[PDB]
Amino acid sequence: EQLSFDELTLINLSKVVTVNGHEVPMRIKEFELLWYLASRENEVISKSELLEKVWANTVNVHIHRIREKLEKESFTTYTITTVWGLGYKFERS
Structure with a gap:
């Protein structure tokens, strides 16, 4: 129901992302993509599964938006991490 990785925290029920304790605004589908992956840390998840389970070029665009906000x-x-050809x-790091 809640997940942290150093200064990053994800709160599932409200779909909130915080970094260093302050809220980082994210669309709900983006949160859900970040949560799907972060919930399965170290697991490589395919674009198909991410697309079916969370929701064109939809996955890549949201991966990028997530990455941008974290940067x-x-x-x-x-x-x-991009796993070329797989997900x-x-x-x-």
Whole structure:
């Protein structure tokens, strides 16, 4: 129901993201993508599954938007890694 990775915290029920304790605004589908991956840390998840389970070019665009916001907030200790040809995984850098 809630997940933290260093200064990053995700709160599922309200779909809120915080970095260093302050809310970082995110669309709900973006939160749900970040949560789907972060919930399965170190697991590589395919674009198909992300697309079916969370919801064109929809996945890549939202992965990028997530990455952009985390960069803006200087959160770098974890990341979403591109696994070419297979999908994405949330993991420690």
